Ligand binder design. Structure first.
Ligand SMILES: *[C@@H]1O[C@H](CO[C@@H]2O[C@@H](C)[C@@H](O)[C@@H](O)[C@@H]2O)[C@@H](O[C@@H]2O[C@H](CO)[C@@H](O[C@@H]3O[C@H](CO[C@H]4O[C@H](CO)[C@@H](O)[C@H](O)[C@@H]4O[C@@H]4O[C@H](CO)[C@@H](O)[C@H](O)[C@H]4NC(C)=O)[C@@H](O)[C@H](O[C@H]4O[C@H](CO)[C@@H](O)[C@H](O)[C@@H]4O[C@@H]4O[C@H](CO)[C@@H](O)[C@H](O)[C@H]4NC(C)=O)[C@@H]3O)[C@H](O)[C@H]2NC(C)=O)[C@H](O)[C@H]1NC(C)=O
Ligand SMILES: *[C@@H]1O[C@H](CO[C@@H]2O[C@@H](C)[C@@H](O)[C@@H](O)[C@@H]2O)[C@@H](O[C@@H]2O[C@H](CO)[C@@H](O[C@@H]3O[C@H](CO[C@H]4O[C@H](CO)[C@@H](O[C@@H]5O[C@H](CO)[C@@H](O)[C@H](O)[C@H]5NC(C)=O)[C@H](O)[C@@H]4O)[C@@H](O)[C@H](O[C@H]4O[C@H](CO)[C@@H](O[C@@H]5O[C@H](CO)[C@@H](O)[C@H](O)[C@H]5NC(C)=O)[C@H](O)[C@@H]4O)[C@@H]3O)[C@H](O)[C@H]2NC(C)=O)[C@H](O)[C@H]1NC(C)=O
Lengths: 206, 208
């Protein structure tokens, strides 16, 4: 049995209204000796907030067991380590994994909206570009909205390490050229721990 | 125990006849108990024997790492031929086969758009030059920046990202002194893709 530990989603940790969680997924759980125990420690201190989820089956006759631990927003943002100890007798080794936020000084993201190029106006749909650069850590959330209504036809590139040690990304919202030249205003909403109120908003219009 | 990893040719290699594209079959975790591994190569089923196997090099973890390199024809890879590397070892319950090929599907011509720096960014000393390449298929592509026929070499390119229409898009960002951009220098975004004429195109960008 091999374990894969996952971090909380960036949006969950930045808004107090949401609940961030650390996901500990055991993937090679076997029918024999399926007693997969879960002990959780924050900064080495055992905590009892976890809730193991029901198992799942696959096409390779292998079970999947997941334990979900709710985490405090500041605990993750302060860098505290989370250790997922998996106690299963399927294999002798008591596999243990640790997770933590990336260490280092958070750097404020820079948000620049870029209008579509003149060459793209030939096409029936144009591309609205949102450039976010100079942020650290890579944990970030980017969304698009217009008139207080979220847009859905956007894709965000994964964060990429830059020369200066910071991260950058692009978010591309694709809309009909009619909407663009009708004068509609679109906004790129960026959430990051180094932002004031963990949120900034840049607008783009004709 | 032994593990096999198959690597595709670099996108620039397959797109230029001048360069030599190749497929690398890397075997790790080769113990001294059975240090001899066999590389058998197949191309769409037919067994080929122009592969050059490198001598077994032992690593510091008492594990051997053997590598075989198969030179592939540019047209063969672009016609979707499948390259299979069969690795045989006496410490293996069964010989391990790995297959690599160009992403199956219909090629899509990339659209190249150069985007000027934001006016808000002009307050800085370094400005960002953006090259949007979208609507291409498959993933294999190369993006480079140059000015005055000389590589800029101060740019970072995002990975290809699967768009909603099934194609791929990416952004390449070139960081340049705000003095150079305002000085009037013209920079060009070079994109190499199989669905491009001569597998090459250039879109330029300058203060307008
Ligand atoms: C003993 O040591 C050796 C190495 O020794 C070395 O030298 C000695 C002297 C010491 O100093 C060592 O410290 C030193 O490391 C160990 O060999 C390693 O073994 C591991 C696995 O156990 C391999 O990991 C894999 O890596 C590949 C990528 O490898 C490229 O990038 C590496 C960057 O570090 C580079 O080192 C590699 O050489 C290789 O680089 C490429 O080389 C080719 C050669 O021609 C070149 O053309 C390329 O340009 C070049 N690229 C770059 C960027 O430089 C990685 O792909 C593997 O991940 C896949 O597999 C995982 C499961 O194995 C899986 O979890 C991943 O998600 C991923 O899964 C795959 O994903 C793809 C795409 O999504 C998908 O299509 C596949 O289906 C999927 N496959 C699956 C799921 O199976 C993996 O991480 C190391 O590369 C290897 N190091 C080497 C070969 O140098 C050896 O393991 C040690 N002994 C023991 C017992 O562990
Ligand atoms: C029986 O079948 C099961 C079902 O899976 C089948 O097989 C799969 C291959 C798929 O084809 C699937 O469709 C099939 O149904 C098997 O379970 C799977 O087993 C494999 C192999 O063990 C696991 O593969 C790993 O995946 C890791 C990523 O997780 C993936 O799954 C999750 C859940 O679906 C995806 O989504 C994530 O979900 C989280 C909640 O659980 C959520 O919180 C998170 O936000 C979300 N993320 C995203 C992006 O959506 C996720 O996207 C993946 O798809 C992957 O990381 C593994 O590769 C890496 O492994 C390590 C760990 O990252 C990495 O090394 C690390 O690098 C770091 C630097 O980057 C270092 O800092 C670390 O120190 C270092 N750690 C080390 C070295 O230990 C490696 O370099 C490598 O890159 C790996 O690919 C599957 O997760 C698992 N589950 C599923 C659903 O597929 C089962 O194994 C089978 N039985 C047997 C016996 O094999």
């Amino acid at each position: 049995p091999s374990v894969f530990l996952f971090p909380p989603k960036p949006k969950d940790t930045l808004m107090i209204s949401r609940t961030p969680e650390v996901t500990c997924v055991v993937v090679d759980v076997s029918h024999e000796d399926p007693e997969v125990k879960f002990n959780w420690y924050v900064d080495g201190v055992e905590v009892h907030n976890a809730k193991t989820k029901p198992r799942e089956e696959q096409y390779n006759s292998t079970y999947r067991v997941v334990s979900v631990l709710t985490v405090l927003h500041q605990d993750w943002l302060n860098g505290k380590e989370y250790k997922c100890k998996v106690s299963n007798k399927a294999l002798p080794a008591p596999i243990e994994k640790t997770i933590s936020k990336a260490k280092g000084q958070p750097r404020e993201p820079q948000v620049y909206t870029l209008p579509p190029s003149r060459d793209e106006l030939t096409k029936n749909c144009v591309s609205l570009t949102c450039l976010v650069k100079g942020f650290y850590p890579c944990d970030i959330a980017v969304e698009w909205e217009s008139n207080g209504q979220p847009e859905n036809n956007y894709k965000t590139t994964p964060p990429v390490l830059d020369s200066d040690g910071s991260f950058f990304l692009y978010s591309k919202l694709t809309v009909d050229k009619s909407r663009w030249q009708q004068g509609n205003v679109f906004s790129c909403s960026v959430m990051h721990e180094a932002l004031h109120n963990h949120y900034t908003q840049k607008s783009l219009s004709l």
